[model samples]
Target: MKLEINKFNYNDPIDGINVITMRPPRHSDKINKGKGPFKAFQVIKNIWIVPERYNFTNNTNDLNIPSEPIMEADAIYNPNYLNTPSEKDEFLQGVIKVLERIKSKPEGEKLLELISSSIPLPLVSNGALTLSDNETIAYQENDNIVSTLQANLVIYGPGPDIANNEIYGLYSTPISNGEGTLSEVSFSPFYLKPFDESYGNYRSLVNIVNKFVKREFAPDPASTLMHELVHVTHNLYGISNRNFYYNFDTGKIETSRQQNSLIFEELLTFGGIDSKAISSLIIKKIIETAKNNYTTLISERLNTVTVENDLLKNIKNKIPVQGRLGNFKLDTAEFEKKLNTILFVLNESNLAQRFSILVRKHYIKERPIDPIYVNILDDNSYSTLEGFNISSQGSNDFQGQLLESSYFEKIESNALRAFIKICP
Candidate 1:
């Protein structure tokens, strides 16, 4: 009997030493374009930021292999077939080193720990805005992100997604292999670089940020990978995936339409808005910009401007003054201009400016660092935007909401038919 041989990986001791092989969906370009039919390099000015393909010859520095990571019994993986045995291992090894690099950095390390571990967040106490309808918006902490990644495959190349011009990193949830097992996909082009390698540069403007990849609003590959991992936790472990936020200012609850709870999840990922370490505008800008870019790419895929616009208007429209809310220093000049930007990024427009604005709205009782918005119990109802109709939109469960309406939910819905397929 013969069948499709879409990809190949010679099962070797070293390969399994780090990670075993697995096939992604047929449409996966990571494996499909490994041998040939590779897309051309995307040139941002003179910088040769390109995707990985059959032959990588121009410069190893172009690959900029980071310091090799400490290998373990099992690890994060590459698709069944990448460029070669070395390239395959190179991809695997680089991810570990990248993880290492992110875990060590001050700004990224907390974000890393948030998704990697299950540290329970504290409850909102009766403080500030007298809590009325807020429910316990809890994201029960869990560990073994490494273990989950071990079961997942990653892509190494120049990412195709560009929103606000920041290259997008993607996380695709598990796909059944017809063998009763599921496989997942995670991709970030810069993750291909080695630990010691310089930041995976994308845009052409700033050449000075050679060492740290800090370019104001742009995020390095490692940072983007962290955001992708957040998605993985949401899909795989059901971690911090809520699409709704109880808006204290509007006295209403709002939800997401982009399938996955992206806008809300992003607030969790970009804790910089409330972190002490973000003293410099340097890191804060990078944090929020990465978030906006990352979430925008996913949101725009299935989100319409009308839906987004209508959804964004649920915030506290009356208050427009500016100051410092949490760790975000709002300096957008005009008041309404900044409000539009915040509306575009935040889960619910609610109190668009927590600090920059004059009035105090909402409440954050405990663990002010982590951003978790609860589903208010008996709140003034919202106007019912497209994704806001929780009771009737689709599934009331988190997974169901993701499938029915997430940022990548539409594609996942098509890929995963409503039921489990049977075997022959």
Candidate 2:
């Protein structure tokens, strides 16, 4: 809860892909004696009242469908970008691989089918040819502050309007049929790295390449894809069914309902676990595979030319991992921010709040570890940052953050603080 990163907007100077940058605030709260920012002992709050906000019905799984078996219903890609036919073709191949990976996972396939299906969005359009402002549904993916429409899932990158840093948006206007607009998907030209091209000997090529080079920063197009699919699911099913709601004040929808993708991405990036999402492990495996693929592509390029041959010797010097961003021992601003939001939601929702309290109660009783002191253990456990932290490192919603083996570490870390603040 002591996390105070001077958060601000950061647009990529090259790509103009805007993201929020988190840096430690110059001034931070002082330590409470030797226990870091943590304070207090056995005495905290006594009467904890669950707030009325989260009193919403717990029909979360009511609308979920299994298996993307509906052959007639599908999400088609719009590759109408400035990418050369070959480049577009290559991205298509990569996208196909990502889809395969997504489908390969049980939850991933269900999520894909859910979003791709003709489940109508719950809105009557203004019926105007163009949206009169305010059609935007702003949410985030990893870092990019995505401003998508209520009816679209934009897969942004280099395109015809690449001049203005315009995104390759896959927009859908309402069709003539009784159905609402379908949410199509897209891919980016820039996200693709040239790997071993389609060849009978490609397996041999990759096997040889992996030995010559190590991993690098190329994101598995699937990581980005899976991240967006969560958003798309939120935009389509979550919004359509009212499981997730919008904050008109911020012009952003709640990034999660039951599971937060922000922490999901954080775990995938840094190697942690969370308890909020039922589909959590599947997400981890999918994104991890995505990382592996990206590393393979980098390996292939290193084994070949692509770029390193021109840069210098031992080009790994510039690969950005030296900063070790994904490590929770180091970066916690995003995770804390995400956690703060989850606590906020949990405080409001009776269902989620009940779940949180139940888990904490279990922690207290099952093991004699006092629930309130968990935060002290958390703050002291990490040595990387001077000020303590709270987190998303922003993906569906609260798949709550856990830095290590403890399934409920993040929730336990701040639960006392959350309860203390809420009660007298």
Candidate 3:
């Protein structure tokens, strides 16, 4: 079949493939309701349909299973183009060609199975198809701004016939001021180094080089889609289903949960402080303002390729660690003890610094940390940290440890702040 190289349109696949598109202005509010500037914000969500095997290399013996789950559409707002109908149509044609190219390959059948296996019941039942426009997506480095595509396959239930299932995405994009010329903008996702180079080997990095190189591979759209899809699958499943309890004292594995709730209680604790002193209120408000400011900074920092280590350092320096209790007319000794507890807890935990950052950047009302989940997480924490060994990093099997520990530390920090914020 001759591929339409002219104005292309996204249509139902002859092989039962589903595509979703979200355009700007119409869908712009969905991404940038409160974030400032058109080019300075990002909208990340699940692209719904998973891709065929994410390792797009022309290999017949790759790990082609249902695990190629979740495609996080990390759509960055492009300042160079508003995605007019002609441009959008052209972009769609390119996408169709890419799809056809993959389908025609020897590994195409395996790829199809990978995508078809991960479709969630919600989408299959709803028959939903969406298209996003109005923003420039980063798909490749050598090319100008291009759109992103994602594919999903079923992994949870048996034979792609599961009931009562849920799906989540792993998405990200950097923001710009929209001040650059057309030639200056780039929407590519290629990298010379792995993300978090300091961390030990991650599986996705290995897969990328294996599939994206050594062959005439499609890097622009395919690279971005695969990178984000792995992210969505790892993070969404990692955090959601791997909540666990640790025996910090005896070095034992207690149990795990699908969610963690102790952190939510800490947020609520801040929202429900019981002190009414003028100084107390003043300090609480100041801390709140600082926290909100720090959140803004971190959000912006995540959009950049460079780690804003200096930003975290600046925040650490600005926060007063000692001697504020007396100024607020609080019981100096008691407050000191509470502060020490927080400090000690933070120091003892391997996740101390990350927790400190999350504490300063906790958006309690965000979807991941929403109030409803708080109740569930709260109940889950009943599994408790009793007898857990907090000294060592312990075994590598602790999948949700990082997130849960960070949330725990954030809660402790907020509780300490609340106590100090209230004066007698």
Candidate 4:
């Protein structure tokens, strides 16, 4: 088959691919109403039709599926020309070709599973595409401004660091009234380093390399790719599903008829949280979350039912330990709170949401702390210090522990401030 490329025309809607076109002067308020840019074509092979827009991040399972799985599309490639439409088309063509190759590969589903494995997956969602002419213009304008800013700023941090210029991004706007000419604006933490900054840890460093180097998806790194893909899905769905949970918060789906896009987010988020999708990630989180909600009820049942403690322990052990994201903490009580948060966040009509909430509630009723914590923490306090054998290092697995323990000590430090803004 021959590949063909054409100018963006309304009449050129691809049968299965949803299309989203961006023209400026679009009111931000009305942005939500635009129909999906791409529509579904026929499902092909084991997957849905080609060229469908899917948030490569959101759809990924713990199994390590790329949110947008890359298949050989039967197209072409030109790596050298960075900004030509022909080059872009060739790149797209190359993706198609690769897709075909992937499909033919004996271990096809295992191939091309990570976001980092291939060239960055183009942002797509809901089996629909995301395109913005305005976004393109904004990016160019941003590139010019940041390039100039880079000359003036002195970057400081680890041996491997992101350029100061890349931090502000294009949308950063300058708000100024007092000056004759406005000074350029940028982000508060105008430098890049690993997500965690401390004296002796390796996870952040590992992550930095994971993102930059082995960028194209690889089999071993699928989990990390899945994690980022979840983030990507959130961005794509955030605006669309923002009101889902807030609008409906109560009991079972058929029992309550509630709507819960947030719970959907939570479950899907967990599904792609780790690079690898082990069979029990979502189920485990649900059970862990439930342990708190149904503590009394499960305790009552435990008195009558002789379920093997070891069996239950094994199930608890299979669940993954989630970290503190945003301002949220990750201790047992916090985990329970997170479960409730997920519950309250979903509406009734969402069956998955209801089941996830109820299941977690029931599991928590019987069990308290998740068994996985045993792997990550120390014994008694269930805090890193007492539970995990390791003490906090400036840069290691317990970096979060360091942050929790000493965040107060360095609240006044400039570096801490920079970290705060960067992280927040």
Candidate 5:
């Protein structure tokens, strides 16, 4: 499909101020001096700094011109956020607050574009927020600012200092089909920020970042700034087949890893919140509960049970991950292990794989798509010989090998509709 770019005013359409929607290699033009778009760029980066896009050729650095623009694209104050607390514990509240603020703001989209322009990465929003059907970068609702905030924060929280140095977050265009399929789309939650400190240019935008230390104010700009920049997990060029703005399983984009009880249990036991730290354990627990018994949880928490016309109409909110809670780092391996265990118990129980099949069927039924591809990572490195496949054809790769010893509980929902899906 051809790319779409729309122009809008502070509230209406700005003449000559058209939106630019180009794929990679085709650089987004520099906002010229006194230009409104350039004005937006100057506002945020003057504080947070711009993130580096991979193989980026346009010299955002030269944005300095005669003298460096106060807001040359840069990443700032990130180290300070990382220094105080670990990825899972810090900054989520701020991320959520920023999301809320953007959702509440009247000029939210402009704000989103301002922040989005700084992060060189691309990632899409899911649920509630809709992208302009015509514009590649524009969003339809204020709520998207919230979704974008959480999505980006997840990447910012976990990026390493090396990889962290580049503004780590979502990209705008679809992911490029590089060496691998790119997991449809994914982002790093915690990472080391990467930078060439040796450039001997400590005074440059890369180094001029001490303004964002405040941690408590709602929609505080510091972490919120970093929060937005972290959405670049997906290389826009790779996943071009999908909408660049909307989320969900577009072009096989993967959702957050299914959190299992082990990781959940650990956070419950070890996660900390103090005068200084924000605990994400509650959110973590919610995810664990969901994965263990998705249907039951959906029925109880997500759906409203309505028995009308002799029908049990249980409608779900179809909320996004952030809707449940803000950003929190999770040990993906442990989380996956717990899910495998849950699946194992469900499979081995008298019901066998019934519950598992139901989950898959429900998912397909809820949001039907053309290409059905499930990512099961049971390769030799991750799986073993002792396993079972619920699907008649077995798993493409065995990912649930850790489920050898698990317990299952039988509840009265729809037994046939709910069973374990095994892979051997």
Candidate 6:
């Protein structure tokens, strides 16, 4: 394609290469619009350039490089066009040189392919130019920028019923310029079908989160996209809530009771009220902020009764891992083991006392309690039970009728369960 030096916004020197910031051609620029559409610089250090026709309308064949721009005598003859004869010649020669340089490097070749695939074309073709109908290939401008910049592609989740094991997405600082903390975030077209197929599951999870947590988890694609975007938001601008903790050992993201509390605490910040008042108004604000950015598209896509029931059933099993709920439907032996795990982790004196009371009220007679475990309980403090008071120093609070274990029930609140898991 014929290189237009004047069209570029500014020049940038990168690693001895004269890199220039080419402003995307606006529709208003008739002379530059269809002539020599440039996707991105092919080579950075080699001073290579590849001007391809970008597919703006349909998102299928974007950033495609067909035949180079037809070099007319009119522009080359003009002073504005690369001024010197050798400079004008260099523009056309640079295209081939860049292509050759890219082919020589394995990484460069892979990057070119990645850029071609990642760039999205418009769904519909622009005007009368049906690039899909033609023999020439079309490329995407967005993909070109991402590839050239070598940004991170953050992939996450199989997402319920999706065929793929994971979904592809992107995150970067905004403006396509290497400035801001997090510029943008978006999922690839590959995720759309999977998201649609698992809409029912997504909706169910959203409903549960909203209904119980009072946080708006929209069941639509826009909201789903927003959730990932929120991560980007947190990176760009600090989040009030607790950020994710990386599990170096397991190489995965893990949540904890402390994290949950931090998020809740952060949520409470917007209220500017005491924790007591938070129970009344926090849910509404959370739901409201969730709905702020985008209009929901799948509001009415309700799951069938069967799907809903199955979802709830699966949630019971899933909660053990997804939420910090102790093992469910535990046998006597299993229950004791689970209890041991909980008690071993619970360090706070008051929480331990509460837990001991719960065990005495609910499991003392039914399940055999280990003597070592029983030793921690204040024996005399309980009105019905044995021997000398096993209460430690500052045990005045131990001699009381604590709330019954029955009051706790199934431990429905995920936040509560998370808290109890570590016993804060």
Q: What TM-score would each prediction reach against the true structure?
A: 0.29, 0.25, 0.23, 0.21, 0.18, 0.18
Q: Which candidate should be chosen as best, given lDDT against the real structure?
A: 1
Regions of model 6 farther than 4 Å from truth: 1-24, 29-81, 84-86, 124-424
Candidate 2 residue runs with Cα over 4 Å from true position: 1-81, 122-186, 189-217, 238-424
Local lDDT at 74 for model 6 = 13
lDDT of each model, Cα atoms only? 0.26, 0.26, 0.23, 0.23, 0.23, 0.24
Please report how far candidate 6 places residue 120 from its true position, in Å. 1.7
Query: Where in model 1 is the C-alpha error above 4 Å?
Result: 1-17, 25-93, 105-159, 162-185, 189-217, 240-252, 256-262, 274-424
How many pairs collide in each candidate, listed in order? Answer: 23, 24, 33, 68, 69, 16
lDDT of 5 by residue, 1-424 (tens): 2111221222222222221111222124343222111110011211111122122223232211213333212122122223332322223332333333333332333334433332221112331222321112221132221111111111123221111222321333322231001111111222211111012211235554653321110111212232223222122112122221111222111223332212222121121221012134533543454344433333343233221221111111111121222221233465445433222221111111221210111101222111111111222211212222223334322222112212111112122211122222
Model 2 TM-score? Answer: 0.25
lDDT of 3 by residue, 90-114 (tens): 3333333333433333333223332
Error of 3 at 125 (Å): 14
Cα RMSD to native, each candidate? 25.3, 26.7, 25.8, 23.6, 25.4, 29.3
Alpha-carbon RMSD, candidate 1: 25.3
Tens-place lDDT per residue, model 6, 105-129, is 3433433332222221111222111
- The segments of candidate 5 whose C-alpha lies over 4 angstroms from its true place after superposition are 1-88, 106-153, 158-174, 177-424
